């Protein structure tokens, strides 16, 4: 039976070294390639899934108030490079309601949301690196403005700067952060609003864009959304895709937020398996006679490496199937095929345009396709990993005796 061939191969050094080099090729194929890595696509698919979720619903998300979730009389805080209605900014300017659950999002939470969204979109735009890479950096810059009387979301206390008018604050807490504050006076030349306002610039240097760094930002994005859970109000295009519900709380998308949260959890553990593959390098060979019972100490590590690769591939498949729209029903399928896997731009990744709202713009379909393409091209590699798993395991047992 096939176990006759398994032992006949388990004691053939040529047949073992062939599998070991098969494991290096498939290991480097997984964690060093990008186009051709089911693992890569599945991390990318998790990230872009979160990113796209906010692009679809941010423009309709209610937010306002002053500094610590406090109601504001006349505050307008505008965050730039955000998917607003008809705009590349989002405008938090809701007054005389305290922010909270099933109400407007605090400016305190929108800052966490916004910063994670800016770091993601830049990182996506540069291009996520292969999972082997942990030393990639990205520089990130984003601005918001505050206008209206009594708006203190830009004060020296909110931003920490030496002085709101012209000040700057630099942080190096490991990665460098420079915040700078600039007042535009109501009667300044160029001031179109004829109203004083404050522009905050955030410049982040050395921000890591590794799989775990970025998968962690995606978790900050989706989790702030789900925990603040602000009230929302959709504006369906006439003759475009219809959304349901039209009003409610952002948590009300329990199906969608859960899908995204498990996709992030799965890709985090998927990324956690790369360290296993690295620590069980399979490239040294294994002129004399060779008997399994004595000189087969590589078997444990050869099995740990192959099994890591297999779990990484299965997890990759799981990430995709959590969102693959052919397998989805009802509203969740409506959400995904009508909005999340669409881009209403007129469009590199991480591009915010005036028409980005109410569409995912995260190449979600192309990544789902790129994930399938990758897996169908893993046919040989996948069999060889299990074949190497079978050999290494029969040698662990010969080694026990």
């Amino acid at each position, epitope marked *: 039976s096939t176990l006759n061939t398994l032992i006949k191969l388990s004691a053939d050094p040529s047949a073992i070294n062939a599998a070991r080099e098969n494991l290096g090729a498939s290991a480097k194929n997984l964690i060093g390639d990008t186009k051709n890595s089911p693992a890569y696509q599945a991390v990318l698919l998790a990230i872009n899934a979160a990113v796209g979720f906010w692009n679809v619903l941010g423009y309709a998300t209610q937010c306002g108030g002053n500094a610590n979730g406090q109601e504001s009389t006349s505050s307008t805080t505008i965050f730039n490079n955000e998917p607003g209605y008809r705009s590349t900014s989002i405008t938090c300017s809701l007054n005389r309601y305290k922010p909270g659950y099933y109400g407007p999002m605090s400016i305190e939470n929108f800052k966490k949301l916004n910063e994670a969204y800016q770091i993601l979109q830049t990182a996506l735009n540069k291009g996520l690196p292969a999972l082997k890479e942990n030393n990639g950096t990205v520089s990130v810059t984003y601005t918001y403005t505050c*206008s209206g009387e009594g708006n203190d979301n830009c004060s020296k206390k909110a931003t920490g700067v030496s002085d709101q*008018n*012209g000040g700057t604050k630099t942080k190096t807490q490991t990665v460098t952060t420079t915040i700078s504050s600039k007042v535009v*006076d*109501s*009667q*300044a030349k160029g001031n179109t609003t004829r109203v*004083s306002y404050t522009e905050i610039t955030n410049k982040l240097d050395g921000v890591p864009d590794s799989a775990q760094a970025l998968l962690a930002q995606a978790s900050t994005l989706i989790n702030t959304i789900n925990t603040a859970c602000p009230y929302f109000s959709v504006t369906n295009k006439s003759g475009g895709p219809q959304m349901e519900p039209t009003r409610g709380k952002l948590c009300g998308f329990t199906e969608e937020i859960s899908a995204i949260q498990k996709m992030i959890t799965d890709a985090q553990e998927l990324v956690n398996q790369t360290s296993v593959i690295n620590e069980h390098e399979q490239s040294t060979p294994v002129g004399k006679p060779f008997n399994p019972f004595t000189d087969a100490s590589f078997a444990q590590g050869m099995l740990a490496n192959a099994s890591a690769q297999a779990k990484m591939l299965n997890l990759a498949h799981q990430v995709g199937q959590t969102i693959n729209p052919d397998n989805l029903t009802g509203t969740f399928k409506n959400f995904v095929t009508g909005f999340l896997a669409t881009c209403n731009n007129k469009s590199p990744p991480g591009t915010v345009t005036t028409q980005t709202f109410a569409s995912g713009c995260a190449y979600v379909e192309q990544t789902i396709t790129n994930l399938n393409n990758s897996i169908a091209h893993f046919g040989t590699q996948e069999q060889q990993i299990q074949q190497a798993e079978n050999i290494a395991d029969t040698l662990v047992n010969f080694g026990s005796h």
Partner: antibody
Amino acid sequence: QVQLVQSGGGIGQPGGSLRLACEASGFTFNLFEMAWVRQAPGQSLEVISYIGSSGSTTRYADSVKGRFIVSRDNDKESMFLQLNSLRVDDTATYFCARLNGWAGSGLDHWGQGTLVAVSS
Amino acid sequence: DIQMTQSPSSLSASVGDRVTITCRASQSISSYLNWYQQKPGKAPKLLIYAASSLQSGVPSRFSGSGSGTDFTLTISSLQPEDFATYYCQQSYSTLWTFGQGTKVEIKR
């Protein structure tokens, strides 16, 4: 309770100089724009000078452009008007007023005035 | 420059009357016009901003109107504190300018 108290002023001669002081309290002085206004005896209100928040931006009426100097001191929350090269028709009450660009609400608050008169 | 022209320059009024001071701009100024009250020997205090916004603390007798070029202040029932002179002032050019004034004195 915004408050602007004025000092200096007095009696000048044709040519030569006076000075006006305006000490602010009860607001964050370095976020608001300030303006000097003067009012001749029987006349109306004339905007003489505007200075920005930072104090680096400066505008003058033609009637006075090359002849006075507006300045602010954001640490002690004070605004100053240096009237050099004086002329008889600068005889007026002089007012420092806070321009409120946050509300868009004009000259929110005014000092009490200080008297200027120049004569041989 | 933009020159504001008030009308009338003077007015004799009575307690409990409805008083109307108009103000005109040479150019279009949109809605950037304010009204001040000035009592003898003291600084003017602001009453109305943005053509129609009642500055806080100001009683509701006062009220603004107009846009672009022709504007109007209304007092719905004159009180003894109100006898003073009133100025309109435009906030559209590089340096703001006032009107010549309107003095409301008590009729008799």
